[PDB]
Amino acid sequence: APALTKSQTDRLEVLLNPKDEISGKPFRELESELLSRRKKDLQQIYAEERENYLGKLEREITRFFVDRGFLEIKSPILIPLEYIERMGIDNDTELSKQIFRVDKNFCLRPMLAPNLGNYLRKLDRALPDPIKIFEIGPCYRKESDGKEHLEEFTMLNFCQMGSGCTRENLESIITDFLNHLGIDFKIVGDSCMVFGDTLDVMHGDLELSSAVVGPRPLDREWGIDKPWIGAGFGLERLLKVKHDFKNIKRAARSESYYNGISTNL
Amino acid sequence: APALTKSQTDRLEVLLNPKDEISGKPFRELESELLSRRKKDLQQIYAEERENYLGKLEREITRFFVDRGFLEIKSPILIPLEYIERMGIDNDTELSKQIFRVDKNFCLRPMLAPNLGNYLRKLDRALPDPIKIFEIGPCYRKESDGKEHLEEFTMLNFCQMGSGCTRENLESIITDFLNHLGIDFKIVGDSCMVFGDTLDVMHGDLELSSAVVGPRPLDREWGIDKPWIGAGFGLERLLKVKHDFKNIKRAARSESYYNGISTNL
Numbered sequence: 004a005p006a007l008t009k010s011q012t013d014r015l016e017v018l019l020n021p022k023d024e025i026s027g028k029p030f031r032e033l034e035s036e037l038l039s040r041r042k043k044d045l046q047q048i049y050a051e052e053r054e055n056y057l058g059k060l061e062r063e064i065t066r067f068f069v070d071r072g073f074l075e076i077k078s079p080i081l082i083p084l085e086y087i088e089r090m091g092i093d094n095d096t097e098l099s100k101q102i103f104r105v106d107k108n109f110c111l112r113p114m115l116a117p118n119l120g121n122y123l124r125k126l127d128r129a130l131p132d133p134i135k136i137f138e139i140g141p142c143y144r145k146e147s148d149g150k151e152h153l154e155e156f157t158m159l160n161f162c163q164m165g166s167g168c169t170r171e172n173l174e175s176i177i178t179d180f181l182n183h184l185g186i187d188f189k190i191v192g193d194s195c196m197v198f199g200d201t202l203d204v205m206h207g208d209l210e211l212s213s214a215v216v217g218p219r220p221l222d223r224e225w226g227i228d229k230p231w232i233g234a235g236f237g238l239e240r241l242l243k244v245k246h247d248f249k250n251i252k253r254a255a256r257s258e259s260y261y262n263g264i265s266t267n268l
Numbered sequence: 269a270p271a272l273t274k275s276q277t278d279r280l281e282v283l284l285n286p287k288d289e290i291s292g293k294p295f296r297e298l299e300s301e302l303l304s305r306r307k308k309d310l311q312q313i314y315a316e317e318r319e320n321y322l323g324k325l326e327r328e329i330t331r332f333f334v335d336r337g338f339l340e341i342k343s344p345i346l347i348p349l350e351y352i353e354r355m356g357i358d359n360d361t362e363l364s365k366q367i368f369r370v371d372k373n374f375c376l377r378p379m380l381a382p383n384l385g386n387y388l389r390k391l392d393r394a395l396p397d398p399i400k401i402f403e404i405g406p407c408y409r410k411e412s413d414g415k416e417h418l419e420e421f422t423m424l425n426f427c428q429m430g431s432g433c434t435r436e437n438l439e440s441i442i443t444d445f446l447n448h449l450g451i452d453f454k455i456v457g458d459s460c461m462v463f464g465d466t467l468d469v470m471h472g473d474l475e476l477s478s479a480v481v482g483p484r485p486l487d488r489e490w491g492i493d494k495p496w497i498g499a500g501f502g503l504e505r506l507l508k509v510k511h512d513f514k515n516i517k518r519a520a521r522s523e524s525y526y527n528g529i530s531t532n533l
């Protein structure tokens with residue numbers, strides 16, 4: 004009955020899944036049981052559904068927003084560095100240090116707002132009020148934390164421009180959206196140096212989203228001058244909460260986890 | 269009846285769609301008709317389907333491969349630069365000049381094979397023969413051309429490892445796949461300095477895919493030592509052929525086109 008070492012405990016925690024029936028037994032026997040369960044999990048997925056959780060959640064979210072009147076956007080991932088400055092991200096500011104630069108000209112987008120802003124302006128010349136669009140896709144930020152942050156993550160951003168752009172409607176859409184996914188939340192006032200007063204959608208201490216009721220003074224910089232509402236959510240945070248993963252690495256695009264199951268068996 | 273200038277003709281060609289009923293009339297009246305048609309196209313999309321073509325094609329392809337027994341993978345977009353060297357991409361070779369480097373350590377993947385190779389090895393410890401997986405996602409290459417090449421594009425890669433890994437089965441899957449999408453093709457032998465003998469799937473002069481029947485000597489470098497087959501396809505090329513777009517910029521993740529309709533109206 005010698006106690007487990009910390010490294011042994013870390014190995015088992017890699018193989019552990021939240022719903023597992025979790026002492027006395029030696030490491031090798033516990034590792035062997037969990038290896039066996041996890042192989043069985045992968046087999047069941049391969050035999051039956053075959054869908055990746057992140058891809059699937061993206062499809063479910065897409066269905067939700069298309070059915071509620073929002074146009075699906077697929078915009079570039081590499082964007083001009085200008086777009087960041089025009090977002091008023093001064094080089095002093097924390098999010099400046101977080102940008103992945105690629106060329107002299109471009110970066111990997113740290114957020115979806117810049118492209119959606121351009122779509123709102125452009126679509127305003129063609130579509131009837133209100134204009135409703137959303138995008139889901141990769142975003143990139145350099146981060147220090149690893150429990151709730153990834154450097155490569157997936158963001159949903161939805162927005163509406165014209166009539167109906169109230170706090171009430173925004174909260175109502177957020178509420179329907181998270182009640183549809185079956186994720187608990189509360190809405191709290193917060194701020195940030197780019198957008199002023201946000202609503203943050205929180206699960207305990209974890210920020211699922213930052214949302215905003217416009218207008219804001221930077222709007223003019225995108226040729227926007229109508230009311231608008233918008234919110235951005237992290238898909239990997241949503242998965243982490245929905246599947247009760249202890250670490251966000253389980254929800255990521257990854258070579259070490261598949262639907263939260265270690266691939267190192 | 270003065271002739272159209274080349275710049276005027278370029279403006280109209282931006283607004284023209286392949287199915288349009290295409291003289292005599294002045295520029296302003298032709299531009300106005302086409303503006304009107306294109307606004308109507310966007311309105312119809314917004315009123316009815318609301319789906320982006322590239323997102324939609326990704327869903328349809330996903331359905332096709334999941335239904336035929338392939339596991340859906342979502343792996344990282346930023347990958348180690350090592351992975352490129354281990355692919356045997358010597359710095360001399362053309363694809364070396366095409367890599368978008370990000371850090372000292374990482375690049376934007378120019379292809380999906382490296383990650384899929386790792387999944388095949390890892391999954392072999394858990395799944396029954398044959399192992400079938402696919403991934404669809406962003407890939408990046410610096411290119412000179414702009415008619416058939418983008419720097420940011422979307423790749424499908426499917427592969428099978430173990431039994432059933434023959435040329436015949438690979439051609440059969442390619443055939444079913446493209447007959448399901450309704451895209452004409454022929455299969456031609458070609459080569460490349462990384463994989464030896466490929467099959468290239470061609471539409472006229474346009475390469476839709478490069479596919480390979482293994483094994484190959486580099487396999488060992490990924491811990492793979494079984495037969496395998498695989499192919500990689502460009503979604504934007506598939507869309508370009510399917511919708512008969514003259515330029516691949518119409519099929520891309522973009523701020524200038526939405527489902528091949530100019531957004532500059």
Ligand SMILES: Nc1ncnc2c1ncn2[C@@H]1O[C@H](COP(=O)(O)OP(=O)(O)NP(=O)(O)O)[C@@H](O)[C@H]1O
Nearest residue numbers: 144146151152153156210211212213235236237240
């Ligand atoms: N590094 C990251 N990894 C995973 N998800 C993220 C990351 N950054 C942002 N998100 C998600 O994207 C949503 C909107 O982005 P944003 O509000 O700008 O992030 P944020 O306010 O910096 N949150 P945090 O960094 O946790 O304090 C957040 O609510 C998160 O759910």
Ligand SMILES: Nc1ncnc2c1ncn2[C@@H]1O[C@H](COP(=O)(O)OP(=O)(O)NP(=O)(O)O)[C@@H](O)[C@H]1O
Nearest residue numbers: 409411416417418421475476477478500501502505
């Ligand atoms: N720059 C690009 N833009 C769009 N699609 C691409 C690009 N590069 C590759 N593809 C697609 O990805 C598939 C597999 O990649 P690969 O065969 O390595 O490209 P390739 O052989 O360099 N083709 P090409 O560059 O046109 O001669 C190709 O058949 C194309 O359909």
Ligand SMILES: [Mg+2]
Nearest residue numbers: 101144146152
């Ligand atoms: Mg942050």
Ligand SMILES: [Mg+2]
Nearest residue numbers: 195210212213
């Ligand atoms: Mg926030």
Ligand SMILES: [Mg+2]
Nearest residue numbers: 366409411417
């Ligand atoms: Mg090429």
Ligand SMILES: [Mg+2]
Nearest residue numbers: 460475477478
């Ligand atoms: Mg090729």
